[PDB]
Amino acid sequence: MPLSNFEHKVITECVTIVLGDAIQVAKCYGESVLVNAANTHLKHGGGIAGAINAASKGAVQKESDEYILAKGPLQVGDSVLLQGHSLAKNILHVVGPDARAKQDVSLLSKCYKAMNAYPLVVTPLVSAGIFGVKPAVSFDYLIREAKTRVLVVVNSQDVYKSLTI
Numbered sequence: 001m002p003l004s005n006f007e008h009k010v011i012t013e014c015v016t017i018v019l020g021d022a023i024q025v026a027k028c029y030g031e032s033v034l035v036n037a038a039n040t041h042l043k044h045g046g047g048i049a050g051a052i053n054a055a056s057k058g059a060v061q062k063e064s065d066e067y068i069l070a071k072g073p074l075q076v077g078d079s080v081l082l083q084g085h086s087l088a089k090n091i092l093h094v095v096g097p098d099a100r101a102k103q104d105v106s107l108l109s110k111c112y113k114a115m116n117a118y119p120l121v122v123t124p125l126v127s128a129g130i131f132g133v134k135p136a137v138s139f140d141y142l143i144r145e146a147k148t149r150v151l152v153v154v155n156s157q158d159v160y161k162s163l164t165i
């Protein structure tokens with residue numbers, strides 16, 4: 001019943017697409033890992049990264065800064081599991097390829113594979129906004145790689161229906 005107050009559709013045995021705010025979906029599941037669509041330096045912009053940071057009152061950005069000081073920047077396709085900040089059990093910061101920077105879009109395979117370590121994942125379509133990848137392409141990589149329970153959350157009905165037609 002958590003998904004009763006969201007428009008949703010089962011796509012595969014692993015993957016369900018959901019209309020809404022990924023942050024609000026993750027909050028319905030205590031055991032969820034929320035995916036952040038990040039960049040290599042975890043400097044969070046106006047996309048879901050900014051929404052996540054704002055919800056955490058800046059704690060996520062500060063935590064990110066400390067991680068990057070200690071370990072250096074992530075490579076495209078990499079991820080790091082950090083604190084949930086009461087948004088989820090944990091937040092998995094994933095670095096999708098940036099198509100505007102002519103990066104290799106197939107690195108989305110590595111992004112989504114990283115999610116399989118967790119029993120329940122709530123994720124946006126990585127790279128499908130500021131990083132300029134078509135939502136259908138990001139979606140196709142997700143369903144190729146998914147081997148755990150994934151709620152893929154899109155905040156646009158246009159996007160939702162384009163992927164459920």
Ligand SMILES: Nc1ncnc2c1ncn2[C@@H]1O[C@H](COP(=O)(O)OP(=O)(O)OC[C@H]2O[C@@H](O)[C@H](O)[C@@H]2O)[C@@H](O)[C@H]1O
Nearest residue numbers: 021022037039044045046047048049124127128129130131
């Ligand atoms: N709360 C949300 N819930 C669900 N989907 C969302 C949400 N917020 C944004 N989206 C949608 O998730 C998709 C991924 O959006 P982005 O946040 O723009 O992610 P990405 O394309 O990977 O760009 C990453 C870059 O944006 C910066 O915010 C981030 O710091 C990084 O530099 C897009 O379709 C976006 O519209």
